[PDB]
Symmetry: none
Subunit: 305 residues, 2 copies
C-alpha cells in the first residue's frame, strides 16, 4: 500500500504554557505568543498558541495537526504538540517576524536582492521537501510563509494540504473557498491539484515578493481570472526583476503542467542567481541595506524530542 | 559578475491577434502571418506568429524568447512578445519577403551589386551588435536572415545563440545537429564557438549571396568537410566576385581565428565597396535592375513599448 506514517503527536499540559500576549484574533480563532516550559528540564521554548467549540472546527484543526506533525524540514513549520483542553490548542514554533507578505510590505526600503533570492530558494526547498513526502500544499502564498528571522523563512498553513496516495498523481477536490488568484488553471477549471499546480502558486508567491507585496490581479475579480489565464495573460514583470528571474515565473505559469519547472529545479536556478544577486535583481541602493527571563530560552529548532 | 539583463518580456493576449494566413509548417511547428491589434490604441501590427506540447519543445522556444527579447538593433529581428496559451506562441515582426537565401534564388536576374554589398554591410552590423552584447549566434547563414524589404534585412533565428559570461571568450558545447558546412574548423573539431567563429559563417553567408544561393560544398558530405578544410581548401570564388571581395571571404576562413577579420572591420570594408558597387561586383546588366484594412497599420519598427 503506502508507507506507515510513524510521526509522533505530542499532547501537552495546559500548565506547561505561559501565554505571554495575544498575537492574532478573528477568522478561525485567537493566536497567542507564549512560552513552553516542559516540566523539569531547564528550557523555555517560544511558541505560538492557536486556541468556542464546534465539531466542524475541532475536526479541521486536528487535521492540520496530523499534517504538521508529519513534516520535518528546516523550511516547514514544526508542530510542537496540541493541548486537549475544553477547546483545542495547536502549539507551534514561534515565528517572531510574522508572515513574509507583511514583512516585505513593512520593510521594502531595506530588503535587498540577497534576501529576496535566498527566500525564494528556501521556499523552493520547503516545497521540494513536501513533494518528497508526496504532500500537496494547495495554498502556497506569501501570507503562508513565516519569518523566523530575516534570513530564515518557513512554509506554513496546511489547512488544505493533502497527502497523495501511493500512485495518485492528482487530487480531485470538491467545492469550498479557494485562493483563485494563486492557483493553476487546471485547479480553477477542474479542481485538480498536483505538485506542479503548487509550482504555479510558487510562481505567484515569488511575484508577490519581487513586487514587494503587491496584489495578484489587483482589480480583476475572481470570476474573471479563469477567463484571463486562458487568454494567454499572466502577472506583469516586476520593476526589479531581470528577464532571467521573470522568465522563471512565467514558466511556472505554463498551461501544460508538465512543462512547468520542478521545485528541485527552482532550487538550482535560484541558488545560482543567489550567488550574484545584483545581476538578477536591480534594487536601488541594494548594496547598502541592513536587516535584523530568557536565560534558558532555546529555539524550537534546537529542542529535539 | 555580469550586467543585469533588464529586457522586458511582453506577454500578449490571444485575443489581440488575427492569424491572417499560414506561412510555414513542418520542422518544429507552424508559422502564421497575422496582425497584432493592441487593445484601444488604433494601431495594427503585421506579425509572424510561431505556434503539440512537449516539455522538450516549450523549453527551447522560451530560450529563443529570452534571447530575442534581449536584443535591440535595426539589423536583428525584434521579438514582440509571447502568448502563453495551451501551446506557446512567439510573436515577432513580420518579414514579408521571407529569408534572404530564398530571395536571392528567386530574384537573381534583378539583384545588382548595390543590394548585394549593402546586405553584407547590414548583416555585419547586426553581427557586430551581437558581439557587443557578448552573444554568439552559432548559426549565421543566408537562411537565417530575413527580408523586411529588399533594402533592409535582419539577422534572425537564435535557437542556438549563447550569451558568453563576463570573460568567457569561448563556448564549449556538446553534441547535437549542427550546420557543419557553415562552421569554423575549431567548432567542428573541438565544438568551440567564438565571435570569430561567427565570422567564418559570415564568410560562407556572403559566399551564398554572391553565388546567388548556391550550396556550400555542394556534393561533399558533412563528414568530409573537416578533412577538406584541413587540406587547405575553401569555397571557390564566385563568378561576380572581384578578387577584392573574395579576398575578404577567404580571410574569414583562416585557421587562426584571431587572424580573421572582426565584424566592425567587415562593416568598414564593405561600406567602402558599397560606395562604388560596380567596381567590386561584376553583374551583367547591373545598372539596369529594379527591386521593390491597413489604414492604421504601423511597422513593428515604429511601435515602441
Amino acid at each position: 500500500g503506502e508507507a506507515p506514517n510513524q510521526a509522533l503527536l505530542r499532547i501537552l499540559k495546559e500548565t506547561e504554557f505561559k501565554k505571554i500576549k495575544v498575537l492574532g484574533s478573528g477568522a478561525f480563532g485567537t493566536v497567542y505568543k507564549g512560552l513552553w516550559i516542559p516540566e523539569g528540564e531547564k528550557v523555555k521554548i517560544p511558541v505560538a498558541i492557536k486556541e468556542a467549540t464546534s465539531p466542524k472546527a475541532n475536526k479541521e484543526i486536528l487535521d492540520e495537526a496530523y499534517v504538521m506533525a508529519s513534516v520535518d524540514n528546516p523550511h516547514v513549520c514544526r508542530l510542537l504538540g496540541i493541548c486537549l483542553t475544553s477547546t483545542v490548542q495547536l502549539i507551534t514554533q514561534l515565528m517572531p517576524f510574522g508572515c513574509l507578505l507583511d514583512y516585505v510590505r513593512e520593510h521594502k526600503d531595506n530588503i535587498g536582492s540577497q534576501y529576496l533570492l535566498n527566500w525564494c530558494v528556501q521556499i523552493a526547498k520547503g516545497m521540494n521537501y513536501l513533494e518528497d513526502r508526496r504532500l500537496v500544499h494547495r495554498d502556497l502564498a506569501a501570507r503562508n510563509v513565516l519569518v523566523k528571522t530575516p534570513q530564515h523563512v518557513k512554509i506554513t498553513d496546511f489547512g488544505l494540504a493533502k497527502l497523495l496516495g501511493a500512485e495518485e498523481k492528482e487530487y480531485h477536490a470538491e467545492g469550498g473557498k479557494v485562493p483563485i488568484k494563486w492557483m493553476a488553471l487546471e485547479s480553477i477549471l477542474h479542481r485538480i491539484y498536483t505538485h506542479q499546480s503548487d509550482v504555479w502558486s510558487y510562481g505567484v508567491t515569488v511575484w508577490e515578493l519581487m513586487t514587494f507585496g503587491s496584489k495578484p490581479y489587483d482589480g480583476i475579480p475572481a470570476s474573471e481570472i479563469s477567463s484571463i489565464l486562458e487568454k494567454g495573460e499572466r502577472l506583469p514583470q516586476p520593476p526589479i526583476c531581470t528577464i532571467d528571474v521573470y522568465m522563471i515565473m512565467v514558466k511556472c505559469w505554463m498551461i501544460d503542467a508538465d512543462s512547468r519547472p520542478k521545485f528541485r529545479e527552482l532550487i538550482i536556478e535560484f541558488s545560482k542567481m543567489a550567488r550574484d544577486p545584483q545581476r538578477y535583481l536591480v534594487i536601488q541602493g541594494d548594496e547598502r541595506m541592513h536587516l535584523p527571563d530568557m536565560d534558558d530560552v532555546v529555539d524550537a529548532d534546537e529542542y529535539l524530542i
